[PDB]
């Protein structure tokens, strides 16, 4: 007999849901976590090569052809949605407090590169590299330095370290002005450090930009090389790890289990449970991804193209790096948004020996999405295979307070997971009424 | 505190067969009648002496994920040996072993070691899986076989020792060296490292 009643039902095993399921199980809540799909990870799963053909190709190749070209399916764990972890980001903080580090190992990403006039340049990760970089001239570097010294010396508490700037009242452009920074330096700080994909931030309060730049500097400072970490065996390990945390603390899991019907309190539209092939399960609230409640979500008005490329060689002009980010700032291509490339390889157990995965992504701004990626495809050298997908981004219409249907946002075009942990924290506050407070797992 | 080899072991098998009790009997030498835990066992570490070698075992438990056959594929990563448990009083749990074998074939390395354990052998009146049938099955699927009782301790230490020996003795020198303490630095980042 299966228990009918739970504190919370969670639908979909994307990482946002799996983190929430783990945190709530840790809080002592009785959680039932269901997925219609036959595997963990939802839209940000890592999949095998055969699955990649099934998903993105018209006529999947034979097992024998696939294995001769690419080796065994077991060697491939290919992210559907590229993300790195900021080394001092919130996801690392959650991983450490929950000991989900016991279920997922991490390696540093070798570097972050920025595109300028057809070439790529490694963004400095230390003082020697900062001295060496041709990205700025000497006098501009001196102005850059005073800016970063202010970033380091600013204490909220103490108005004497503010240099006449107010992070809430001054725009980021005004902050740049105080330090006399030119437009190319603004683009570099904004796009390579704050990692904005557009220039909207210039006319917005400085605070969020200040915090993002501080986050970047703290992250590169943790271990050097770059601000990023990446999980061994791919991003799919993350939801699996948080699902294990939830199971340890009492959570119950069902996969390959369609939701036949969502149940609502009569004449109210409020959640009460779900009917499945295994029975009817009840809880006072549900947490779910957009695919379970499409009617309760809206498009953000953005579509992201993601091109998963398989190479049999390293990316040119990266010193044969095992992993990297490339950033193509919008101004370099006359675009409205940056193009990213995320490159990982056999060093991270995501492909067979000798191969590289290069996943290119951007928000579509033209009528020929494939053509928008050409400047990025050109950076990769010869490409063995491409698997192309386009995703529309969704967000909940409402915060869930009215109907106890607490929905996550689709995974966005940003190159790392900070916006995903922002979503976790926001959903947790919505669900529980108090900010998330992490305790160290004992 | 130092060790010769470190092996990663998993327990697998249908819910209710006594995997968590088997692990607690081995690790803590305790048994709780009608065992139910609010927080499931994650893993236990136990160092054993094996033909004059110190073998550290990190033995993973399922955290209940087997109930509806939702074991995370990550569970099998880096495993060296897998102990498949059924209940000698429960024919279906024995039949379920064929399915777990298929999972292991799918998610674990081709060279993983396997062992079949028939648990609850203390329940003599209620036995339905005949020893010779289980043994012939284990033979036909390339694994040794023991019947155990977490309750009264029958064969529990020996089951875990059997597996640690299947591994240590089956491993190519390349594979065995990678399990040594000197080779524990895998080039991964310690997130709890200042
Ligand atoms: N008689 C007997 N009962 C056992 C034995 N091992 C476990 N049990 C009981 O079987 C039930 C399930 O045990 P548990 O360890 O949770 O099984 P799991 O679901 O495979 O982890 C509990 O009531 C245990 O007390 C055993 O060797 N003999
Ligand atoms: C506390 C540790 C310190 C101050 C040394 C490490 C330096 C960091 C974290 C800053 C990295 C600097 C940049 C990305 C500046 C870019 C510089 C140029 C393009 C010249
Ligand atoms: C917590 C760490 C932070 C905020 C980074 C601080 C880093 C600084 C001040 C170093 C920046 C260095 C350069 C831009 C290179 C300077 C080199 C020349 C002027 C030749
Ligand atoms: Mg158990």
XYZ file of C-alpha atoms and ligand atoms in Angstrom:
705
model
C 0.000 0.000 0.000
C 1.277 3.473 -0.875
C 0.670 6.376 1.518
C -1.913 8.759 0.147
C -0.864 11.946 2.018
C 2.276 14.119 1.785
C 3.403 17.585 2.900
C 4.541 18.458 -0.632
C 4.298 16.920 -4.111
C 7.078 17.848 -6.567
C 6.684 17.308 -10.348
C 9.669 16.992 -12.647
C 13.226 16.194 -11.670
C 14.995 19.217 -13.066
C 17.660 20.624 -10.782
C 15.464 23.461 -9.368
C 12.867 20.890 -8.242
C 15.418 18.393 -6.962
C 17.094 21.114 -4.804
C 13.746 22.157 -3.374
C 12.752 18.514 -2.761
C 16.058 17.961 -0.893
C 15.796 21.141 1.203
C 12.203 20.459 2.176
C 12.956 16.809 3.079
C 15.855 18.136 5.211
C 13.386 20.560 6.892
C 11.381 17.432 7.958
C 8.651 17.640 5.289
C 7.178 14.414 3.778
C 7.823 14.766 0.014
C 6.563 12.794 -3.007
C 8.621 13.511 -6.162
C 7.233 12.305 -9.513
C 8.487 12.498 -13.092
C 6.572 11.551 -16.267
C 9.957 10.906 -17.903
C 11.874 7.674 -17.477
C 15.049 9.389 -16.172
C 16.224 12.211 -13.881
C 17.033 15.756 -14.838
C 14.099 17.296 -16.695
C 15.040 19.880 -19.307
C 18.634 20.228 -18.088
C 19.385 16.457 -18.127
C 22.559 14.988 -19.548
C 21.844 12.303 -22.148
C 23.560 9.545 -24.089
C 24.635 9.817 -27.708
C 21.850 7.500 -28.879
C 19.388 9.797 -27.065
C 20.902 12.792 -28.732
C 20.132 11.215 -32.162
C 16.620 10.308 -31.069
C 15.957 13.849 -29.924
C 17.588 15.994 -32.620
C 17.944 13.880 -35.816
C 15.468 12.596 -38.377
C 17.035 9.153 -39.021
C 19.118 7.956 -36.047
C 22.161 5.950 -37.078
C 22.698 2.262 -36.205
C 24.387 1.109 -33.012
C 27.344 -0.191 -35.079
C 27.905 3.054 -37.013
C 27.522 5.120 -33.812
C 29.981 2.963 -31.866
C 32.576 2.913 -34.647
C 32.483 6.739 -34.898
C 31.986 7.652 -31.242
C 32.563 4.656 -28.966
C 30.210 3.269 -26.308
C 26.997 5.112 -25.249
C 28.119 4.770 -21.603
C 30.981 7.246 -22.218
C 28.592 10.056 -23.245
C 26.752 12.363 -20.809
C 25.800 15.326 -22.914
C 24.166 18.377 -21.310
C 21.017 19.512 -23.069
C 21.419 22.964 -21.468
C 24.916 24.343 -20.863
C 25.753 25.803 -17.436
C 28.864 26.282 -15.338
C 28.972 26.825 -11.538
C 30.455 30.063 -10.163
C 33.063 28.850 -7.666
C 31.749 31.218 -4.910
C 28.150 31.063 -6.044
C 25.067 30.049 -4.105
C 24.955 26.524 -5.637
C 28.369 25.784 -4.203
C 27.128 27.107 -0.803
C 24.098 24.749 -0.966
C 26.237 21.813 -2.080
C 28.555 22.248 0.889
C 25.835 22.737 3.523
C 23.870 19.656 2.324
C 26.899 17.458 1.648
C 25.615 16.781 -1.900
C 29.324 17.069 -2.581
C 29.270 13.382 -1.502
C 27.383 12.505 -4.719
C 28.999 14.849 -7.273
C 32.659 15.625 -8.003
C 33.845 18.906 -9.618
C 36.735 20.078 -11.762
C 37.777 23.646 -12.574
C 37.003 25.022 -16.010
C 40.356 26.068 -17.606
C 39.428 29.609 -18.547
C 36.943 32.152 -19.899
C 37.744 33.733 -23.316
C 36.312 36.869 -24.849
C 35.846 37.468 -28.586
C 37.128 40.734 -30.053
C 37.258 41.422 -33.825
C 37.290 37.762 -34.935
C 39.816 36.490 -32.359
C 39.476 35.144 -28.796
C 41.468 36.317 -25.726
C 41.759 34.591 -22.356
C 40.216 36.783 -19.654
C 42.809 37.223 -16.864
C 42.496 34.958 -13.825
C 45.517 36.359 -11.951
C 47.717 39.485 -11.727
C 50.384 38.215 -14.187
C 47.665 37.538 -16.779
C 46.141 40.974 -16.074
C 49.537 42.621 -16.662
C 50.014 40.603 -19.890
C 46.594 41.044 -21.474
C 46.378 43.068 -24.711
C 42.664 43.627 -24.024
C 43.478 47.101 -22.542
C 46.266 49.671 -22.858
C 48.363 50.804 -19.882
C 46.454 53.967 -18.971
C 43.084 52.255 -19.256
C 44.404 49.423 -17.079
C 45.356 51.937 -14.379
C 41.771 53.283 -14.390
C 40.479 49.664 -14.354
C 42.656 48.932 -11.285
C 41.244 51.815 -9.230
C 37.769 50.552 -10.097
C 38.559 47.017 -8.912
C 40.307 48.380 -5.786
C 37.033 50.136 -4.942
C 35.106 46.853 -5.517
C 37.461 45.174 -3.008
C 37.434 48.020 -0.431
C 33.745 48.822 -0.404
C 32.089 48.021 2.913
C 28.337 48.583 2.993
C 28.621 49.325 6.717
C 31.159 52.112 6.280
C 30.318 55.172 4.154
C 33.984 56.271 4.086
C 34.850 53.508 1.598
C 32.122 54.477 -0.932
C 34.089 57.158 -2.858
C 30.965 59.344 -3.058
C 29.049 56.582 -4.812
C 25.703 55.117 -3.847
C 25.013 51.594 -5.152
C 21.250 52.161 -5.136
C 21.075 55.784 -6.331
C 23.866 55.711 -8.925
C 23.572 53.770 -12.220
C 26.415 51.513 -13.317
C 27.290 54.040 -16.067
C 27.728 56.693 -13.347
C 29.985 54.338 -11.422
C 32.077 53.844 -14.599
C 32.233 57.656 -15.000
C 33.646 58.191 -11.491
C 36.580 56.013 -12.589
C 36.775 57.460 -16.125
C 36.342 54.124 -17.926
C 35.876 54.089 -21.738
C 33.297 52.100 -23.739
C 35.529 49.080 -24.481
C 36.359 48.751 -20.739
C 32.693 49.081 -19.853
C 31.894 46.195 -22.302
C 34.643 44.045 -20.811
C 33.572 44.587 -17.196
C 29.852 44.295 -17.973
C 30.043 41.218 -20.265
C 33.157 39.330 -19.160
C 32.936 40.000 -15.394
C 29.366 40.921 -14.504
C 28.300 38.509 -17.300
C 25.373 40.588 -18.494
C 24.252 39.367 -21.957
C 23.141 42.863 -22.891
C 23.817 46.507 -22.016
C 20.541 47.176 -20.159
C 22.492 47.247 -16.838
C 24.204 50.544 -17.777
C 21.072 52.549 -16.944
C 20.038 50.481 -13.898
C 21.115 50.847 -10.210
C 24.741 49.804 -9.705
C 24.117 47.359 -6.821
C 23.387 44.121 -8.867
C 26.344 44.822 -11.179
C 28.581 45.514 -8.144
C 27.548 42.211 -6.559
C 28.039 40.248 -9.851
C 31.532 41.726 -10.323
C 32.429 40.977 -6.709
C 31.033 37.400 -7.194
C 33.233 36.980 -10.284
C 36.381 38.203 -8.524
C 35.684 36.087 -5.425
C 35.048 33.055 -7.643
C 38.251 33.336 -9.690
C 40.067 33.977 -6.397
C 38.861 30.653 -4.852
C 40.965 28.320 -7.087
C 42.398 30.433 -9.942
C 42.147 29.692 -13.685
C 38.568 30.856 -14.127
C 35.505 31.615 -12.060
C 33.888 28.236 -12.894
C 33.470 24.654 -11.825
C 31.836 21.788 -13.798
C 30.607 18.381 -12.505
C 32.260 15.124 -13.514
C 29.810 13.115 -15.665
C 27.829 16.190 -16.599
C 25.141 18.452 -15.217
C 22.706 15.505 -14.853
C 24.644 14.453 -11.732
C 23.338 17.537 -9.868
C 19.569 16.725 -9.861
C 20.412 13.071 -9.157
C 22.428 14.163 -6.135
C 19.733 16.396 -4.689
C 17.161 13.603 -5.330
C 19.376 11.272 -3.288
C 19.491 13.953 -0.466
C 15.693 14.092 -0.530
C 15.397 10.248 -0.469
C 17.761 10.035 2.505
C 15.595 12.475 4.424
C 12.393 10.636 3.678
C 11.457 11.580 0.095
C 9.609 9.130 -2.197
C 10.440 8.959 -5.938
C 8.433 7.768 -8.963
C 9.687 7.915 -12.566
C 7.932 7.028 -15.866
C 4.726 8.041 -14.099
C 2.437 10.318 -16.150
C 0.157 12.674 -14.268
C -3.242 11.392 -15.448
C -5.068 14.240 -13.700
C -4.266 17.117 -11.394
C -6.836 17.417 -8.572
C -8.212 20.741 -7.327
C -10.450 21.845 -4.463
C -13.881 22.342 -6.103
C -14.824 25.839 -7.447
C -11.448 27.306 -6.275
C -8.660 26.198 -8.641
C -6.381 25.250 -5.702
C -4.096 22.208 -5.671
C -4.986 19.095 -3.667
C -3.250 16.179 -5.444
C -2.518 14.050 -8.518
C -3.900 10.833 -10.034
C -1.430 8.362 -11.494
C -1.299 4.703 -12.638
C -0.090 3.958 -9.073
C -2.945 5.747 -7.290
C -4.071 9.142 -6.094
C -1.682 11.182 -3.920
C -2.559 14.314 -1.923
C -0.635 17.277 -0.498
C -1.435 20.920 0.411
C 0.973 22.238 -2.220
C 2.820 21.290 -5.401
C 6.205 22.478 -6.772
C 6.596 21.828 -10.512
C 8.256 22.805 -13.744
C 6.339 24.565 -16.556
C 5.765 21.329 -18.538
C 3.283 20.121 -15.885
C 1.176 23.312 -15.858
C 1.620 25.007 -19.243
C -1.620 26.965 -18.718
C -0.150 28.548 -15.550
C 2.983 29.799 -17.346
C 3.792 32.467 -19.904
C 6.540 32.922 -22.453
C 9.241 35.397 -21.438
C 9.249 36.307 -25.168
C 12.692 34.760 -25.708
C 13.751 31.651 -27.563
C 17.196 30.170 -27.047
C 19.010 28.213 -29.738
C 21.368 25.541 -28.404
C 23.713 23.808 -30.813
C 25.494 20.804 -29.367
C 28.630 20.200 -31.425
C 30.905 17.175 -31.286
C 34.533 17.787 -32.176
C 37.327 15.279 -32.426
C 39.983 17.901 -31.554
C 40.483 20.880 -29.185
C 39.068 24.305 -29.903
C 41.567 26.467 -31.838
C 43.396 29.271 -29.947
C 42.684 27.960 -26.453
C 46.054 26.428 -25.702
C 44.395 22.964 -26.029
C 42.236 23.681 -22.967
C 40.175 20.755 -21.661
C 37.253 23.084 -20.939
C 36.415 26.725 -21.367
C 33.816 29.385 -21.839
C 33.796 31.645 -24.859
C 31.922 34.957 -24.586
C 31.032 36.807 -27.809
C 29.916 40.289 -26.606
C 26.965 41.683 -28.477
C 28.868 44.772 -29.701
C 31.335 42.564 -31.600
C 28.586 41.209 -33.853
C 26.104 44.128 -33.874
C 23.780 42.001 -31.772
C 21.332 42.553 -28.930
C 22.673 39.624 -26.882
C 25.895 37.791 -26.300
C 26.642 34.338 -27.753
C 28.179 31.801 -25.391
C 30.115 28.646 -26.002
C 30.599 26.039 -23.270
C 33.288 23.491 -23.973
C 33.981 20.327 -21.949
C 35.640 17.078 -22.942
C 36.758 13.591 -21.883
C 38.391 15.267 -18.810
C 34.898 15.676 -17.342
C 33.635 12.161 -18.370
C 31.039 13.552 -20.763
C 32.293 12.060 -24.046
C 34.571 9.305 -25.265
C 38.319 9.776 -25.506
C 39.526 12.466 -27.915
C 36.192 14.192 -28.336
C 35.060 17.648 -27.200
C 31.565 18.906 -26.661
C 31.001 22.542 -27.613
C 27.568 23.839 -26.867
C 26.786 27.206 -28.447
C 23.814 29.248 -27.272
C 22.175 32.611 -27.606
C 18.802 34.287 -27.533
C 17.493 34.258 -31.113
C 17.193 37.741 -32.670
C 16.848 36.947 -36.391
C 14.689 34.898 -38.701
C 17.471 32.453 -39.515
C 18.518 31.131 -36.072
C 21.178 28.714 -37.431
C 22.942 31.577 -39.269
C 23.185 33.640 -36.040
C 25.556 31.005 -34.685
C 27.925 31.029 -37.686
C 30.594 33.299 -35.977
C 30.648 30.797 -33.096
C 30.719 27.687 -35.326
C 33.699 29.305 -37.112
C 35.697 29.381 -33.834
C 35.477 25.607 -33.415
C 37.396 24.207 -36.353
C 35.947 21.147 -38.160
C 32.725 19.845 -36.553
C 31.893 16.117 -36.601
C 28.196 16.443 -35.783
C 25.757 19.134 -34.750
C 22.542 18.591 -32.754
C 20.373 21.683 -32.905
C 17.504 22.570 -30.598
C 15.446 25.670 -29.863
C 13.722 26.236 -26.509
C 11.092 28.852 -25.639
C 11.623 30.257 -22.125
C 8.674 30.128 -19.685
C 7.959 31.697 -16.306
C 5.014 31.349 -13.935
C 2.146 33.773 -14.417
C 1.733 33.989 -10.600
C 3.876 33.250 -7.500
C 1.761 30.274 -6.357
C 0.337 31.850 -3.202
C -3.194 31.854 -4.613
C -3.378 28.203 -5.801
C -0.405 26.487 -3.908
C 1.096 25.735 -7.342
C 4.681 26.874 -7.089
C 6.368 26.837 -10.493
C 9.950 27.157 -11.543
C 11.332 29.184 -14.447
C 12.671 27.491 -17.614
C 16.491 27.320 -17.588
C 17.681 30.540 -19.139
C 20.457 31.616 -21.548
C 22.899 32.662 -18.803
C 26.153 30.739 -18.769
C 26.042 29.644 -15.126
C 23.572 28.543 -12.425
C 23.198 31.722 -10.305
C 19.773 32.577 -11.761
C 18.658 28.939 -11.058
C 19.609 29.268 -7.348
C 17.897 32.685 -7.268
C 14.783 30.802 -8.463
C 15.216 28.089 -5.787
C 15.534 30.730 -3.018
C 12.556 32.680 -4.315
C 10.362 29.534 -4.585
C 11.434 28.418 -1.105
C 10.468 31.843 0.374
C 7.127 31.630 -1.508
C 6.491 28.099 -0.181
C 7.619 28.543 3.466
C 7.189 32.323 4.099
C 10.735 32.781 5.351
C 14.094 33.105 3.571
C 16.042 29.895 3.153
C 18.537 29.375 5.955
C 21.098 26.703 5.299
C 22.400 24.666 8.219
C 25.444 22.437 8.010
C 24.207 18.842 7.576
C 25.284 16.698 10.484
C 43.774 5.801 9.297
C 45.974 4.943 6.268
C 44.856 2.125 3.888
C 46.113 -0.096 1.007
C 43.068 -0.051 -1.306
C 39.776 1.811 -1.301
C 36.810 0.088 -2.960
C 33.334 1.503 -3.627
C 30.568 -1.076 -3.046
C 26.822 -0.826 -3.660
C 23.833 -2.661 -2.283
C 20.915 -3.269 -4.591
C 17.748 -5.365 -4.573
C 14.008 -5.047 -4.005
C 12.611 -3.010 -1.112
C 12.250 -4.916 2.134
C 14.862 -7.604 1.594
C 17.132 -6.244 4.357
C 19.821 -4.205 2.532
C 19.928 -1.430 5.122
C 19.919 -3.936 8.005
C 22.731 -5.901 6.305
C 24.829 -2.709 6.070
C 24.153 -1.691 9.692
C 24.975 -5.197 10.940
C 28.264 -5.039 9.029
C 29.199 -1.447 9.957
C 27.798 -0.973 13.494
C 27.185 -4.586 14.591
C 23.627 -3.700 15.518
C 20.240 -5.062 14.493
C 16.902 -3.431 15.235
C 13.803 -5.648 15.063
C 11.200 -4.354 12.572
C 13.752 -1.763 11.438
C 12.335 1.565 10.232
C 14.492 4.734 10.018
C 13.391 8.312 9.421
C 16.757 9.244 7.896
C 17.985 6.428 5.614
C 21.518 5.120 5.664
C 23.659 7.009 3.109
C 26.892 5.050 3.163
C 29.184 3.522 5.754
C 32.952 3.255 5.792
C 34.612 0.125 7.211
C 38.253 -0.867 6.914
C 38.911 -4.611 6.798
C 42.093 -6.694 6.765
C 42.375 -8.802 3.629
C 45.277 -11.249 3.010
C 47.584 -8.821 4.832
C 46.201 -5.756 3.020
C 44.170 -2.930 4.569
C 41.049 -2.449 2.440
C 38.835 0.557 3.060
C 35.261 -0.082 1.946
C 32.814 2.692 1.258
C 29.516 0.883 1.017
C 26.525 2.669 -0.392
C 22.887 2.050 0.400
C 19.870 2.883 -1.715
C 18.070 5.424 0.473
C 14.806 3.760 -0.517
C 15.166 4.707 -4.200
C 14.536 1.084 -5.211
C 10.929 1.177 -4.020
C 9.630 2.228 -7.427
C 12.877 1.356 -9.249
C 14.203 4.971 -9.367
C 17.814 4.409 -8.517
C 19.731 7.432 -9.729
C 22.230 6.371 -12.509
C 24.838 8.351 -10.548
C 24.525 5.623 -7.867
C 26.546 3.240 -10.054
C 29.358 5.736 -10.950
C 32.794 4.512 -9.872
C 31.476 1.331 -8.302
C 33.799 -1.674 -8.066
C 31.386 -4.265 -6.678
C 27.640 -4.699 -6.332
C 25.861 -6.962 -3.834
C 22.393 -7.963 -5.068
C 20.127 -8.958 -2.228
C 16.852 -10.925 -2.241
C 14.772 -12.382 0.606
C 14.673 -16.209 0.809
C 11.052 -16.001 1.994
C 9.970 -13.910 -0.982
C 9.906 -15.493 -4.471
C 9.252 -12.177 -6.194
C 12.360 -10.643 -4.624
C 14.353 -13.498 -6.183
C 12.660 -13.064 -9.550
C 13.553 -9.334 -9.317
C 17.267 -10.200 -9.408
C 17.075 -10.708 -13.197
C 15.928 -7.077 -13.564
C 18.671 -5.692 -11.240
C 21.240 -7.577 -13.302
C 19.964 -5.820 -16.417
C 20.335 -2.455 -14.589
C 23.843 -3.265 -13.585
C 24.669 -4.245 -17.218
C 23.306 -0.866 -18.326
C 24.851 1.524 -15.786
C 27.886 -0.086 -14.227
C 31.277 -0.812 -15.835
C 31.470 -4.089 -17.756
C 34.093 -5.269 -15.235
C 32.043 -4.642 -12.047
C 31.974 -7.596 -9.613
C 28.620 -9.022 -8.533
C 27.505 -11.151 -5.565
C 24.086 -12.720 -4.866
C 22.842 -12.635 -1.277
C 19.697 -14.465 -0.106
C 18.841 -12.679 3.173
C 16.550 -13.591 6.116
C 17.838 -17.154 6.278
C 16.830 -17.133 9.980
C 13.211 -17.539 8.780
C 13.413 -21.321 8.289
C 9.686 -22.010 8.269
C 8.996 -19.297 5.694
C 11.771 -20.099 3.153
C 10.483 -20.537 -0.407
C 13.576 -19.984 -2.567
C 15.467 -23.243 -2.600
C 19.213 -23.000 -2.175
C 20.036 -25.137 -5.257
C 17.800 -23.073 -7.515
C 19.389 -19.781 -6.315
C 22.901 -21.239 -6.580
C 22.294 -22.507 -10.163
C 20.952 -19.060 -11.013
C 23.954 -17.303 -9.515
C 26.193 -19.670 -11.535
C 24.321 -18.887 -14.741
C 24.880 -15.131 -14.092
C 28.557 -15.131 -13.081
C 28.243 -14.487 -9.364
C 28.979 -16.250 -6.123
C 26.117 -16.839 -3.711
C 25.566 -16.675 0.064
C 22.482 -16.846 2.275
C 22.619 -14.379 5.154
C 20.743 -13.043 8.176
C 21.198 -9.445 9.328
C 19.083 -10.464 12.356
C 21.292 -13.249 13.671
C 24.486 -12.265 11.782
C 24.727 -15.467 9.627
C 27.259 -14.895 6.808
C 27.032 -11.054 7.008
C 30.723 -10.304 7.518
C 31.526 -13.101 5.046
C 29.315 -11.570 2.351
C 31.125 -8.241 2.451
C 34.495 -9.981 2.686
C 33.612 -12.197 -0.300
C 32.910 -9.112 -2.375
C 36.057 -7.251 -1.257
C 38.023 -10.353 -2.382
C 36.216 -10.713 -5.710
C 37.323 -7.143 -6.474
C 40.921 -7.150 -5.180
C 41.654 -10.444 -6.945
C 39.864 -9.639 -10.246
C 41.435 -6.220 -10.799
C 44.054 -5.477 -13.442
C 47.143 -3.764 -11.968
C 46.182 -0.449 -13.621
C 42.745 -0.573 -11.926
C 44.132 -1.698 -8.546
C 46.724 1.104 -8.405
C 44.020 3.732 -8.927
C 42.383 2.532 -5.680
C 45.522 3.176 -3.578
C 45.795 6.044 -1.073
C 48.609 7.724 -3.067
C 46.221 7.854 -6.049
C 43.272 9.338 -4.157
C 43.884 12.838 -5.599
C 41.691 12.661 -8.706
C 42.301 16.326 -9.678
C 38.856 17.361 -8.448
C 38.190 20.471 -6.401
C 37.454 20.306 -2.669
C 34.496 22.681 -2.231
C 35.051 22.590 1.566
C 38.705 23.564 1.061
C 40.023 27.015 2.004
N 13.906 -12.033 10.043
C 14.703 -11.099 9.476
N 14.211 -9.867 9.190
C 15.059 -8.963 8.615
C 16.432 -9.307 8.232
N 17.012 -8.200 7.665
C 16.093 -7.241 7.668
N 14.930 -7.691 8.208
C 13.688 -6.935 8.379
O 13.202 -6.694 7.056
C 12.613 -5.370 7.010
C 13.337 -4.535 5.952
O 14.690 -4.265 6.332
P 15.510 -3.129 5.574
O 16.896 -3.258 6.060
O 14.843 -1.811 5.705
O 15.360 -3.639 4.047
P 15.723 -2.777 2.715
O 14.439 -2.123 2.269
O 16.238 -3.865 1.759
O 16.784 -1.768 3.136
C 12.697 -4.807 8.420
O 11.520 -5.106 9.180
C 13.874 -5.555 9.010
O 13.839 -5.615 10.445
C 16.893 -10.650 8.574
O 18.049 -11.036 8.271
N 15.971 -11.473 9.134
C 42.135 38.566 -3.173
C 42.928 38.136 -4.424
C 43.401 39.047 -5.380
C 43.157 40.559 -5.219
C 44.188 38.547 -6.615
C 43.309 37.789 -7.631
C 42.761 38.626 -8.615
C 41.420 38.670 -9.030
C 40.393 37.756 -8.352
C 40.942 39.660 -10.121
C 40.884 39.149 -11.578
C 40.990 40.263 -12.425
C 40.397 40.602 -13.652
C 39.403 39.671 -14.364
C 40.767 41.959 -14.282
C 40.886 41.940 -15.812
C 42.030 42.615 -16.249
C 42.422 42.977 -17.546
C 41.590 42.672 -18.798
C 43.740 43.713 -17.733
C 38.277 40.343 -4.355
C 39.159 40.707 -5.575
C 38.954 41.813 -6.417
C 37.799 42.807 -6.213
C 39.910 42.027 -7.601
C 40.906 43.176 -7.384
C 41.915 43.159 -8.353
C 42.782 44.187 -8.746
C 42.724 45.575 -8.085
C 43.829 43.905 -9.841
C 43.479 44.519 -11.209
C 44.603 44.541 -12.037
C 44.739 45.033 -13.336
C 43.574 45.661 -14.099
C 46.098 44.936 -14.027
C 46.900 46.211 -13.820
C 48.003 46.242 -14.660
C 48.588 47.376 -15.213
C 48.013 48.775 -14.908
C 49.819 47.215 -16.128
Mg 16.921 0.267 2.893
